[PDB]
Design a protein around this ligand. Sequence first.
Ligand SMILES: Nc1noc2ccccc12
Ligand SMILES: Nc1noc2ccccc12
Lengths: 150, 150
Amino acid sequence: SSPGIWQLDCTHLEGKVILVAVHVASGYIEAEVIPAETGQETAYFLLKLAGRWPVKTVHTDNGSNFTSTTVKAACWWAGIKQEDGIPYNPQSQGVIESMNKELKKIIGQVRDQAEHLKTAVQMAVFIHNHKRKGYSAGERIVDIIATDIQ
Amino acid sequence: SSPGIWQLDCTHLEGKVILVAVHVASGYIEAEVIPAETGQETAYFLLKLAGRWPVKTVHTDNGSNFTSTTVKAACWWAGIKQEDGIPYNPQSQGVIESMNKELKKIIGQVRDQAEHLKTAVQMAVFIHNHKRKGYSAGERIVDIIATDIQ
Ligand SMILES: Nc1noc2ccccc12
Ligand SMILES: Nc1noc2ccccc12
């Protein structure tokens, strides 16, 4: 069920790790800076996400997170179906790649404003989700989920 | 209007500080554990919130956060109208008080599961937002915002 499908994405900047969850149907994102991509960090991130949006399915970003007992435990706890993240459709991967580039671009544009990377990342989340493409990703996710509920 | 109104709430547990944002019309929440309630922590929390939901107005939890230049800067950045949190309607306070008690109750119920308070708090957010009262707070916020957009 497409309203409930999210994709994990891990990208790197400034020797640091940015973990992103993308709501596939809308392009809406949540993101966090973590010191490294561990099972425990990913598990906690998913718990936060699922408390905030109705997350039914997660396409994990790599095999380590797919295998992780801690990630599996979090998915069990939160009622998430954990799936692999293989682009059986190869255009999917280029979309994520483009988003990572966009996000890094925005991060660069706010570095006269933010002392810490985590602030810049949250500014990028804001700008990304409010950007009008015409509706924004934020508007799209709410519309999609509301239509599903009704 | 009412779709964009949030209330800040700071509560204490285990010598630690739990910062909560409540979407007043739905009862939907986001929350975080912070070491102490500073302007910088509150500012960052609001930035995260506003990137994720269309936050128009925030009723601040106390006068220190209302006064804080850092909080004011974050509200400016994110396009949030910063307001006081005075219960001109006195029933408002008791509602928040009840929610804090409920949240602490859930936190207690999951402490055989979570090593760290932050995990327990996010479990509480999940349980709170999914609880059916009949719709859940999560369903209500999406419906309210979607209706506003349309
Ligand atoms: N969750 C949201 N509904 O509408 C939005 C507009 C901008 C950002 C987030 C949202
Ligand atoms: N943002 C949400 N839409 O629906 C939900 C159901 C449960 C929790 C959160 C949400």
